[PDB]
Amino acid sequence: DQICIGYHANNSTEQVDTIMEKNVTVTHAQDILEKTHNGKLCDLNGVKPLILRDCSVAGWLLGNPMCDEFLNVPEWSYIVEKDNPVNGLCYPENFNDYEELKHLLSSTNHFEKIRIIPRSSWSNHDASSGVSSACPYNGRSSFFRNVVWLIKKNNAYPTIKRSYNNTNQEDLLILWGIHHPNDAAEQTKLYQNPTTYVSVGTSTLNQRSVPEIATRPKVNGQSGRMEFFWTILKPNDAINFESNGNFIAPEYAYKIVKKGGSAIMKSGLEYGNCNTKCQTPMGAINSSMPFHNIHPLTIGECPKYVKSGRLVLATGLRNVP
């Protein structure tokens, strides 16, 4: 007659690692590493993202004619831009503090567009000839839609003096620019006055830009260049513009809604008509696992990211036949 003490055993094939020994087969284990995603870009808790497709953030904000899809985008959860969107600055040039503006976007969920300076408000200047073959639309020369490339009228460019007061509750993102002609002859043909500038002033901003008339290689058929600026006009503050030429004046600006909590995700995927609580640039994640090794740049309620290929915890004991 006997009584023996013993331990469980099964047909488990699960394996775990330890410092002194690898691949120890155990009776029970627990995988804690999520390794799959759905390969799509979904809505984040019901809110759809802003998929810029072939337009860059600048193409969208300035109003590149090829970006009409985003003239009035609604509230978004996160933003997706491609690595190299073809539609950005149709007329060649530079966008000042572009990366800082993009970073600012990353902390907002909505840009409501409003008209701060009617295009019909320019009575002593040509506000219709400001176009270029570099920004085509419906087979003809056009231009960024949110700003105005002002031209001289009746062989004159009387000095401009415009002021705008932010009577809204939200911070206002204002964009404007200046044109750098290719030579003196061009300066005279477009603005008449040879020596010009664009001065802008708010309670905090002080600036005066001058055109740098030079000749350069052709980009999108143009050897001229546009230089764009931006500032945030606080509620109740006013912005003053003065210029005797080369001014690319604002028309539309954006009211900023800091519902705060966004991100500019780099991806070539399009919208996958799905909903998730955790999104990576490669696809969504839906799991209870504490960890995941999909991608490090995620948004929403997600598992912790690690580079591990395998992460299994032992729960049961060593499985001995």
């Binding site: 007659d1 006997q2 469980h8 099964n10 990366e99 991100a263 912790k304 032992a314 049961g316 004991l317």
Partner: protein, 160 residues
């Protein structure tokens, strides 16, 4: 194992005991059979469950990468940014992997210790009334039946 029981003085496991992690296998007149020890088994289950939860909860403040862009003349800060984010990802990946490795080892020794202590508890019970075969089994001198067997597991076993 560290406590020498599992795959030790008790050479193998019992495929026939599906009632738990540790238990007994008796043999008398009436018959034989396996019976998992619910006390120690459950005590182990609670311990492992708390361990898994602790591990997870301790990995709730890990670093989180944030997307930023830099222009052509900001290569130094872009690299500083990249080295920093990779830096923390490598640290937490190390933390996750090492913690699992170390605890997995402790989990195996934990089970080993439980078996060893269950065995020793029984050994103390069957003071001089049983013979230690040294294989995890005890052979009684004078016959012992199902009521007697249940007595040991009952933890009530005692001449008193």
């Amino acid at each position: 194992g560290l406590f020498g029981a599992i795959a030790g003085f008790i050479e193998g496991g019992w495929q026939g005991m599906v009632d738990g992690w540790y238990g007994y296998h008796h043999s008398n007149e009436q018959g034989s059979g396996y019976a998992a020890d619910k006390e120690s088994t459950q005590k182990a289950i609670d311990g492992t469950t708390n361990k898994v939860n602790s591990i997870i909860d301790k990995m709730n403040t890990q670093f989180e990468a944030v997307g930023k862009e830099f222009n052509n003349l900001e290569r130094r800060i872009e690299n500083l940014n990249k080295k920093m984010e990779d830096g923390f990802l490598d640290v937490w990946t190390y933390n996750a992997e090492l913690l699992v490795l170390m605890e997995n080892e402790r989990t195996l020794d934990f089970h080993d210790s439980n078996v060893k202590n269950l065995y020793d508890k029984v050994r103390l019970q069957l003071r001089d009334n049983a013979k230690e075969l040294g294989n995890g089994c005890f052979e009684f001198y004078h016959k012992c039946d199902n009521e007697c067997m249940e007595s040991v597991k009952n933890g009530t076993y005692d001449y008193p």
